[PDB]
């Protein structure tokens, strides 16, 4: 499903043919990626003292992953990869009604 979505997106992200036997191991890589993430969101949201995981709860985590910097903030990272109708939810546009 979604792991199959990412391995297919791996094909258009690696720009280069790979093997299916590589894909079920990258599936375990995504499973462990969540096995680190969802308890990294767990511990980071607990660090903020909030039960829920707000967007800034993940901005700090992505700062940990070195992908958010003072040059590359959270929102700019949304520009480069997410589609428009999806970043319309994340980065606040303006209508005098900023999302």
């Amino acid at each position: 499903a979604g792991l199959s979505h990412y391995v297919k997106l791996f094909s258009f992200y690696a720009k280069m043919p790979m093997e299916r036997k590589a894909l079920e191991m990258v599936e375990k890589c995504l499973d462990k990626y969540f096995q680190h993430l969802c308890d990294d969101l767990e511990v980071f949201a607990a660090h903020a003292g909030r039960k829920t995981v707000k967007p800034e709860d993940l901005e700090l985590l992505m700062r940990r992953q070195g992908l958010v910097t003072d040059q590359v903030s959270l929102h700019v990272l949304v520009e480069r990869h997410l589609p428009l109708e999806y970043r319309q939810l994340l980065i606040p546009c303006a209508y005098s009604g900023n999302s």
């Binding site: 546009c93 303006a94 209508y95 005098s96 009604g97």
Partner: protein, 38 residues
């Protein structure tokens, strides 16, 4: 050097009365300013 500004401000009317809360064509002022003739 002026039409090149008139093809810039024009295309930021095709992109400002699009991305905002436009209510673009249900208005008689913009309807002649939007659909801006090339």
């Amino acid at each position: 050097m002026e039409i090149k500004i008139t093809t810039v401000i024009q295309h930021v009317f095709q992109n400002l009365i699009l991305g905002s809360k436009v209510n673009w064509a249900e208005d008689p002022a913009l309807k002649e300013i939007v659909l801006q003739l090339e």
